[PDB]
Design a binder for this molecule. Structure first.
Ligand SMILES: Nc1ncnc2c1ncn2[C@@H]1O[C@H](COP(=O)(O)OP(=O)(O)OP(O)(O)=S)[C@@H](O)[C@H]1O
Ligand SMILES: Nc1ncnc2c1ncn2[C@@H]1O[C@H](COP(=O)(O)OP(=O)(O)OP(O)(O)=S)[C@@H](O)[C@H]1O
Ligand SMILES: Nc1ncnc2c1ncn2[C@@H]1O[C@H](COP(=O)(O)OP(=O)(O)OP(O)(O)=S)[C@@H](O)[C@H]1O
Ligand SMILES: Nc1ncnc2c1ncn2[C@@H]1O[C@H](COP(=O)(O)OP(=O)(O)O)[C@@H](O)[C@H]1O
Ligand SMILES: [Mg+2]
Ligand SMILES: [Mg+2]
Ligand SMILES: [Mg+2]
Lengths: 319, 348, 329, 261, 325, 261
DNA sequence: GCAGACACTACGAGTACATA
DNA sequence: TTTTTTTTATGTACTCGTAGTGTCTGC
């Protein structure tokens, strides 16, 4: 036997062990206790626990009838126009005896990869056989799922995890794993995770396996500080036409080994949600796209990024 | 047959202008080891006449017996595209710009089949064939980058005579591989001599003043000058000194479009000018000639401290037009910038 | 006994015939001796000798009987997609090195893949080449030829030992052109060969083409400087002085007139940009005026590099230098 | 006025899918001796001769010598609706510009007529010289269908030589050459398998692969295939369609490329 | 035995001890291997830092030579890696057992940035469902080309650029095993021109050993063609001190004599501008101008005109700097 | 020098049509004892071992041992054009890359030399354990191929169980369960049809259906296939050719997880 | 034994889209 | 309170129609 990593070994098996989104998880716990759950779409950031919530709800609702009354489909399966017509539909008509308030659950994980025609063919088999079967969909970008499917469900939306919600499960994993720690190292783990519980467990396991103790510099020796938190400060330095500090942060990110594509992509994501004027943001985005054209055609050096920073500083001083 | 085709010279010694260049081209192709040629100059100068005179000098008189040949080429997207081709018993002429952006496929498949095949008759036909690539300035950069190894590997068997208007659109990999032959436009006196010789060969009398006005109105284009000379013969046989010369409709339409630009500077006038530019673009007029005619007419109504900024604006928006794909955006941007500059100049 | 033009007749057959590219020629010469030949990347201006060096090298290493079985040459003239790299290049790189030379000359234990004009390869097709060179380098070698190294991705740049082909110096080009003229029974004056090596600007193919064309034009007599000037498309100095007189006049009508004169006489705008820049960097203008005139010359040359119209770029550059000359008036 | 009747419907179901991908038109020339079809491609590489005599038709009425042209795109969709062992009758009037094609059952009350527009094409007869070749050999039809499909997996151009030992089929490519020499199979029960050589001058020539593979789907039309070729005369492939006539094919040699370093 | 291989492949770190720079990451990876708890890895960084060699050393340490074909399914950008492969051979490799010896398998996906988004989306539940039987290693250069679900599933180790302090002894080992005469300035030139990349350092060393036979600063800067620091300082001194024609003549004479290229001159001048205490407006103008010149050199342009513009970008700001006082 | 010679060509046809959709390249290991082939599939799940004896060849000579990597997609297009009552010649020089596949046509006249190009894929030698199997079952190949086809209709992966009574095949599929249990059917006139049990320990393993039907394409090679199975070491589908050698197959079991409940 | 009918997979063809 | 159409140049994925072809039934 091989020991599992802490991401999959410490997966919650009950709905009370899932932290974050307390109202939605509590309502899912009530549904799992009583029954008659509706069709459900859970959307959110990766690592929030949508697959965990769906699987825990299905395991608590079905129980011993799991192997015959649950159909799990993933992106590793086909889920084409033929699988919806001959596999989802045949399982929907299929007779499975169940207790009262319990239905067959068709789990369609990662429904963004589902094609538009397959989701169109999924509608009438969802509406007709709702007396016998139920659907549970999980997705990251809810815009890829078509509107008639979203109208057929209660579209639940998951938010990014609060640091205390990660911290409680970090206490849980630490006391079942007997991990020596300090407080600042766990704040470093939370800071490296950035709302991702998978990244929190991965970084905690890496720091425990590599060093055996959780302080700040043991975490930052193998993990990394998040990239757009420095890009926000460098864009802020570009806002006040301060080219020296902006180039200092750009050169620090360049000597860390980041490619120009990743740097300019995080620049664009920071400038998307930055707090400035609307016209200044628009000409900043136009300048970023003009530089990204030169990055894409082949020329990508520190000189191009410094020229982009200087043009962004020029956009402030040119009303 | 019109006057542009009935009185075209056949041999290099019959050319009335650029006779020293005709003797140089006579001495160039005599041995047969001449390199690839890049015949460039203004349109209507006589580049194709010199190329066919070179082809007459190399082979027999069989280069004037042409035929239309059709070839269907398969794209990488598996869509069949038909391309027309002028071919003779000694040479062949290709216009790859008729295929659009698929000219790279024409260079990669059509040209290699011609270049990789040695000529069937070696005694009547010479030791090499000639491929005429006409309008290589309109070629995309991918087709020009696919061209270069064909001009190096099978050069001693397949020779090339490239014809274009501007050598700035030709990449320096191609420009290094071929000897550039410059054919300037004939002056007013050479065009007057050609028109007088054509009119005397038809039994007519042509005054010097009318021939001079035909030469200035054609802007040193011998094809256009011979066409308006034939048109002036058609409309009125007595060749008066002040006989009205007919004009093409797109040029005067461009003049009226620029007059409408000057007359009002408002967004709805900009919309009407955009409709006029749509009318000009839908008649297959190239957008750089629209920009050139616009700058030719709008600078007549500008004052002396405004012409440089309008010229720089026109060149900048023409370069952005050649970088982009949609002509109407850059044309309307140039027109809107000119209206803004004209309103700022007149209101101050 | 057919005639052959001089660019292919004087194409280097061996490595010692390549001129002025001393470091890479020494590298391939030690590879000819038997040293570990690395993956090569050749880049530089046109006419410098990137294709001929590797072709003469492969002819030297393999001979006539092993060129077809050890060299795969791919250019932009054939199809190089993701599938050609994934199938044809990988199946060639996975082949066995079998067959030795019959003349007793040593045979190298690798194949050579020549990807000439690798700027035209896509970024996806270049990404499929990486572990082909990393895995199959025991039995094959890769030589990418390009003109701009920015079009080559950074993994492929890092995998290949880069050799930059410099533009040829005046001295080496002068001796090579004099040797070619001596071998062809033709004569050229000192001013003629000086103007030839000034016009060619390190392009040996252009120099050989101009020398051959002047030989055919004159017929075998003295190749003087005037046949070089009228064979190169060099604008006469009177046109440049007329352009500067129209610029110093301060009126746009004479400026349009001389720009229309230069356009109608078939002069290329690259030659006008070169001669105009040569005049501006060698006169008594101020440093600020020279600075923004040269900046306009650079941006006009760039705008001509993407194939913009000649007349509008020339009228914009002439308007800018007209404003610069008439500002101090 | 032209009206003809066929003995079997499978003749047009075996002759007309063969020229699905060769020629862009079907020009039938009416004479008193029979019908004639001489057409070329758009690439001017293959020539097809189809001559069916009048003695084998069920009926044949002819008064004038005309020339009609039939397209392929509408014709190919019609024949899939037609039968196999039925009779196919045709009708064309003197002044009408619409050829009538009927593929009715041999015992039926009603007919089925899918007419098409006559294309007014202006073509001329190039004229085959019918000169003496260098080699004339006889080959089986079904075996020729296999050996044309054989070399399609090797390269794109094949080489056919024909010496006194036999006819040599070669296909050189990046994979490996393949050599096939049919010879001396007269000791068989069937008269179909008798491979004979009639003449003697050997000629080596290269022919394109695709046009031979476009030919060998019409192999159950005839029993044997006669192969005729010379040094500069194009390769002639002869078919004999039962008792009603004969079919002739023509391939110009494929252009061989240069050899370099 | 002697072999005919490039020095970037003849000298490959077959073990984890032969890699030089990322000591903490490799110590953590060795502790993952020794404790039999290796997770799904995401090795990303600039090229030439040793990401392929790290996972090849890991696969060589984990599995012996008699069972390597049954445990490692290595797929890179040279192979077709579509969604048919993810739903086919990769899924069948992940969901099955081992033929010879019981153990966990490894799927190495080199150049995972070149994979499509459909294959990356189909890869998520293959990683998550069969994590006990097999582990997936994704190696990429651009982390933005990997979907955030795959970044969440795999713990990431940033293989940053190789610092020249720890990069020296590996080059010393290659020199000692290759019998190469090298000076101190030659090794300094190698670790300066390499710029955090041990592949091009070995390529420069092999090319300089073949071209000259010795590795000195002059030989390295001649074989590479890079300008020396003193010549870049002289070019900056000419552009900031003298008039247009004299500085143009000096820089053109230096470029003709040395055979320099304008790209390396632009790179080193851009590096020397941030060290020189410029005003903010002057630095912004200079950065924009050199960005324009370095963009302009990517097409069929004349290099002399761009050199004149490079001089012009400093002759503009000379008067501004002096009048700033 | 390597010169092997197949006594009938039908033996090579049935071998390489079983590895056509399964194995990636043919790596022939050549020695004086015979021709070996030990290569995994593309998915690194299945393993094929093929050993042909030198005594089964017509003439076999091998001066020095060779490793012979040959692409099979290009290889499998040559056994399509091969007879079954015919002679197959295999040639390989000492330091060359050509592989002469010389045979005769079904018309039985002509030599047909086809060439391959050798590959340089180095491969580490995979050690066959040669351990004792806890379930050895003799069973006909026709019956093993039939119930593998019937089980592909019902499910995706099949549960194969062996015990004292006999083998048992279970397919938990979409439409339901398909259970086939066969035993002691040696009381027939034929000697090929026989189910025999040799060892004792009862195992249970799940295998992919797409490889079990791939392995049963060697049905014309052997009348009876030996099935070897145990708990740890994989399933073996063993074909023993009568006068040529043996064909050895391996297939790893699938990963299954019991429900927590 | 050979002609007709059945489902089977390989292949050709058309279409959409690729970002946060 | 207002709706047509094929261009962008590859790479990949999806979906559907069609065509050899192995195999089964029957007189
Ligand atoms: N809310 C949570 N509470 C506790 N553990 C969690 C939570 N979310 C994630 N985890 C842990 O992270 C692992 C992976 O969570 P997942 O449910 O797979 O993430 P996800 O929400 O499905 O995101 P995607 O879209 O599938 S990448 C689980 O096995 C848990 O160990
Ligand atoms: N270094 C050189 N030594 C001798 N002859 C040369 C040299 N460079 C160029 N030539 C001559 O010029 C011809 C063209 O040289 P090429 O090697 O094709 O130039 P190039 O490097 O390929 O330029 P590009 O990038 O392909 S446009 C050769 O056939 C020679 O005749
Ligand atoms: N850390 C290192 N220690 C020692 N040698 C190294 C190191 N990194 C790279 N090298 C050398 O450089 C060669 C190439 O290293 P690679 O592992 O292929 O680089 P890489 O990390 O794969 O970069 P990319 O993104 O794949 S191009 C190796 O064979 C070594 O010779
Ligand atoms: N030397 C000449 N003598 C008389 N007519 C000429 C001469 N050169 C050109 N022409 C006429 O002028 C026109 C120029 O067109 P063309 O020769 O195609 O050159 P271009 O390709 O530059 O338009 C032709 O129609 C031709 O009849
Ligand atoms: Mg999930
Ligand atoms: Mg080249
Ligand atoms: Mg790597």
């Amino acid at each position: 036997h091989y020991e599992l990593p802490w991401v999959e070994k410490y997966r919650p098996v009950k709905l009370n062990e899932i932290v974050g989104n307390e109202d939605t998880v509590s309502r899912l716990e009530v549904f799992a206790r009583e029954g008659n759950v509706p069709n459900i779409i859970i959307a959110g950031p990766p690592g929030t626990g949508k697959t965990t919530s769906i699987l825990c709800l299905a395991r608590a609702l079905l129980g011993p009838a799991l192997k015959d009354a649950m159909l799990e489909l993933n992106a590793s399966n086909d889920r084409g126009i033929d699988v919806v017509r001959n596999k989802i539909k045949m399982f929907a008509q299929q007779k499975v005896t169940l207790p009262k308030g319990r239905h067959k659950i068709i789990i369609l994980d990662e429904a963004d990869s589902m094609t538009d025609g397959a989701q169109q063919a999924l509608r009438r088999t969802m509406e007709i056989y709702s007396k016998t079967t139920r659907f549970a969909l999980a997705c990251n970008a809810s815009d890829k799922i078509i509107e008639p499917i979203q109208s057929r469900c209660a579209v639940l939306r998951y938010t990014k995890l609060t640091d205390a919600q990660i911290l409680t499960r970090l206490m849980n994993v630490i006391e079942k794993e007997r991990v020596p720690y300090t407080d600042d190292g766990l704040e470093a783990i939370i800071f490296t995770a950035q709302g991702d519980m998978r990244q929190a467990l991965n970084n905690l396991q890496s720091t425990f396996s590599g060093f055996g103790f959780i302080n700040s510099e043991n975490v930052f020796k193998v993990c990394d500080e998040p990239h757009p938190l420095l890009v926000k400060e460098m864009i802020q330095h570009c806002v006040n036409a301060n080219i020296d500090e902006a180039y200092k942060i750009l050169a620090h990110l360049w000597h860390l080994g980041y490619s120009p594509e990743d740097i300019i992509g995080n620049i664009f994501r920071v400038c998307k949600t930055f707090q400035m004027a609307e016209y200044l943001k628009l000409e900043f985005i136009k300048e970023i796209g003009y530089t990204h054209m030169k990055i894409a055609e082949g020329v990508n050096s520190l000189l191009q990024m410094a020229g982009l920073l200087a043009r962004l500083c020029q956009k402030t001083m040119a009303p | 047959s019109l006057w542009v085709d009935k009185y075209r010279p056949c041999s290099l010694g019959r050319l009335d202008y650029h006779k020293e260049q005709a003797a140089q081209l006579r001495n160039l192709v005599q041995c047969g080891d001449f390199p690839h040629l890049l015949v460039y100059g203004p349109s209507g100068a006589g580049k194709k006449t010199r190329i066919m005179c070179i082809l007459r000098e190399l082979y027999g008189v069989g280069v004037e017996k042409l035929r239309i040949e059709h070839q269907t080429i398969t794209t990488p997207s598996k869509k069949k595209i038909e391309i027309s081709t002028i071919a003779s018993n000694y040479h062949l002429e290709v216009n790859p710009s008729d295929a659009g952006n698929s000219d790279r496929v024409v260079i990669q498949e059509m040209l290699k089949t011609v270049a990789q095949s040695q000529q069937l008759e070696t005694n009547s036909q010479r030791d090499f064939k000639v491929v005429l690539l006409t309008e290589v300035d309109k070629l995309t950069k991918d087709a020009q980058h696919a061209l270069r190894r064909t001009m190096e590997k099978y050069m001693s068997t397949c020779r090339l005579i490239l014809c274009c208007n501007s050598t700035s659109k030709v990449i320096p990999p191609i420009r290094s591989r071929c000897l550039a032959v410059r054919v300037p436009a004939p002056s007013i006196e050479d065009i007057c001599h050609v028109l007088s010789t054509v009119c005397k060969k038809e039994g007519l009398n042509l005054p010097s003043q009318l021939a001079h006005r035909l030469a200035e109105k054609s802007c040193r284009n011998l094809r256009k000058a011979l066409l308006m000379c034939e048109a002036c013969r058609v409309q009125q046989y007595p060749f008066t000194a002040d006989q009205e010369i007919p004009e093409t409709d797109w040029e005067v339409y461009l003049r009226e479009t620029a007059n409408a630009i000057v007359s009002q500077q408002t967004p709805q006038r900009l919309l009407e000018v955009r409709g006029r530019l749509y009318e000009l673009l839908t008649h297959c007029i190239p957008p750089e000639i629209i920009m050139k005619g616009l700058l030719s007419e709008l600078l007549h109504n500008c004052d002396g401290q405004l012409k440089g900024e309008v010229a720089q604006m026109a060149a900048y928006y023409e370069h952005r037009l050649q970088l982009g794909s949609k002509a109407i955006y850059h044309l309307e941007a140039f027109v809107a910038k000119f209206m803004a500059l004209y309103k700022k100049f007149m209101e101050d | 006994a057919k005639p052959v033009p001089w660019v292919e007749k004087y194409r280097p057959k061996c490595v010692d015939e390549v001129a002025f590219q001393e470091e890479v020629v020494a590298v391939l010469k030690k590879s000819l001796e038997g040293a570990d030949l690395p993956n090569l990347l050749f880049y530089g201006p046109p006419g410098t000798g990137k294709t001929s060096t590797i072709l003469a090298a492969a002819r030297e290493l393999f001979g006539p009987e092993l060129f077809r079985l050890r060299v795969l040459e791919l250019n932009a003239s054939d199809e190089r997609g993701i599938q050609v790299v994934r199938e044809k290049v990988k199946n060639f790189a996975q082949l066995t090195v079998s067959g030795s030379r019959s003349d007793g000359k040593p045979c190298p234990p690798f194949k050579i893949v020549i990807l000439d004009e690798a700027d035209s390869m896509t970024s996806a097709a270049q990404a499929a080449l990486r572990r082909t060179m990393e895995k199959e380098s025991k039995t094959t070698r890769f030589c990418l030829i390009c003109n701009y190294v920015s079009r080559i991705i950074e993994p492929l740049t890092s995998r290949c030992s880069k050799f930059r082909f410099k533009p040829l110096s005046d001295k080496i080009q002068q001796q090579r052109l004099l040797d070619i003229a001596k071998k062809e029974n033709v004569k050229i004056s000192d001013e003629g060969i000086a103007y030839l090596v000034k016009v060619s600007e390190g392009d040996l193919r252009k120099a050989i083409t101009f020398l051959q064309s002047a030989t055919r034009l004159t017929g075998g007599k003295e190749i003087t400087e005037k046949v070089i000037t009228d064979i190169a498309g060099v604008i006469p100095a009177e046109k440049i002085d007329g352009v500067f007189a129209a610029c110093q006049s301060g009126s746009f009508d004479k400026l349009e007139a001389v720009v229309k004169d230069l356009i109608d006489e078939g002069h290329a705008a690259t030659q006008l940009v070169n001669q105009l820049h040569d005049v501006v960097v060698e006169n008594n203008l101020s440093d600020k005026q020279k600075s923004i005139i040269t900046e306009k010359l650079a941006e006009v040359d760039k705008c001509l590099a993407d194939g913009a119209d000649e007349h509008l770029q020339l009228i914009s550059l002439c308007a800018t230098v007209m404003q610069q000359l008439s500002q101090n008036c | 006025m032209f009206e003809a009747r066929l003995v079997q419907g499978s003749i047009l179901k075996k002759v007309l899918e063969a020229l699905k991908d060769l020629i862009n038109e079907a020009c039938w020339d009416i004479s008193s001796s029979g019908v004639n079809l001489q057409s070329m491609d758009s690439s001017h590489v293959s020539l097809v001769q189809l001559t069916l005599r009048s003695e084998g038709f069920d009926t044949y009425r002819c008064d004038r010598n005309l020339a009609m042209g039939v397209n392929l795109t509408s014709m190919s969709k019609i024949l899939k609706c037609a039968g196999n062992e039925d009779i196919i009758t045709l009708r064309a009037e003197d002044n009408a510009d619409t050829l009538a094609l009927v593929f009715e059952a041999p015992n039926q009350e009603k007919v089925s007529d899918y007419e098409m527009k006559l294309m007014d094409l202006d073509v001329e007869q190039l004229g085959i010289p019918e000169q003496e070749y260098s080699c004339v050999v006889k080959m089986p039809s079904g075996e020729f269908a296999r050996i044309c499909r054989d070399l399609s997996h090797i390269g794109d151009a094949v080489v056919i030589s024909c010496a006194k030992d036999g006819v040599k089929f070669s296909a050189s490519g990046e994979l490996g050459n393949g050599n096939i020499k049919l010879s001396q199979t007269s000791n068989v029960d069937k008269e179909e398998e008798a491979v004979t050589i009639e003449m003697n001058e050997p000629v080596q020539l290269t022919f394109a692969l695709r046009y031979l593979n476009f030919f060998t789907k019409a192999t159950p039309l005839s029993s044997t295939v006669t192969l005729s070729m010379s040094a500069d005369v194009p390769l002639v492939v002869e078919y004999k369609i039962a008792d009603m006539g004969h079919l002739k094919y023509y391939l110009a040699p494929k252009i061989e490329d240069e050899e370099g370093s | 035995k002697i072999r005919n291989l490039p020095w970037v492949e003849k000298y490959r770190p077959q073990t984890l001890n032969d890699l030089i720079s990322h000591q903490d990451i490799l110590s953590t990876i060795q502790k993952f291997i020794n404790e039999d708890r290796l997770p799904h890895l995401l090795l990303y960084g600039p090229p030439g830092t040793g990401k392929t060699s790290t996972i090849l050393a890991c696969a060589k340490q984990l599995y012996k030579d008699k069972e390597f074909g049954s445990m490692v399914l290595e797929l890179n950008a040279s192979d077709d890696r579509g969604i048919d492969i993810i739903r086919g051979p990769i899924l069948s490799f992940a969901s099955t057992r081992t033929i010879f010896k019981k153990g966990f398998k490894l799927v190495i996906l080199d150049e995972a940035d070149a994979m499509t988004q459909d294959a990356q989306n189909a890869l998520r539940r293959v990683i998550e469902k069969f994590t006990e039987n097999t582990r997936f290693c994704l190696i990429c250069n651009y982390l933005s080309k990997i979907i955030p679900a795959l970044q969440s599933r795999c713990t990431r180790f940033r293989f940053g650029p190789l610092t020249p302090e720890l990069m020296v002894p590996r080059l010393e080992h290659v020199v000692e095993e290759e019998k190469v005469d090298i000076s101190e300035d030659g090794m300094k030139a190698l670790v300066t021109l390499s710029s955090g990349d041990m592949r091009r350092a070995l390529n420069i060393l092999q090319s300089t050993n073949m071209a000259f036979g010795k590795v000195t600063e002059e030989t390295v800067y001649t074989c590479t063609g890079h300008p020396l620091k003193s010549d870049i300082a002289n070019i900056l001194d000419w552009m900031l001190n003298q008039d247009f024609t004299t500085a143009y003549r000096n820089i053109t004479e230096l470029k003709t004599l040395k055979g320099l290229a304008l790209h390396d001159i632009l790179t080193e001048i851009h590096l020397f501008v941030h060290r020189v205490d410029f005003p903010s407006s002057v630095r912004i103008h200079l950065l924009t101008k050199m960005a324009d010149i370095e963009y302009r050199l990517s097409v069929g342009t004349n290099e002399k005109i761009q050199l004149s513009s490079l001089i012009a970008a400093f002759q503009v700001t000379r008067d501004l700097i002096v009048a700033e006082a």
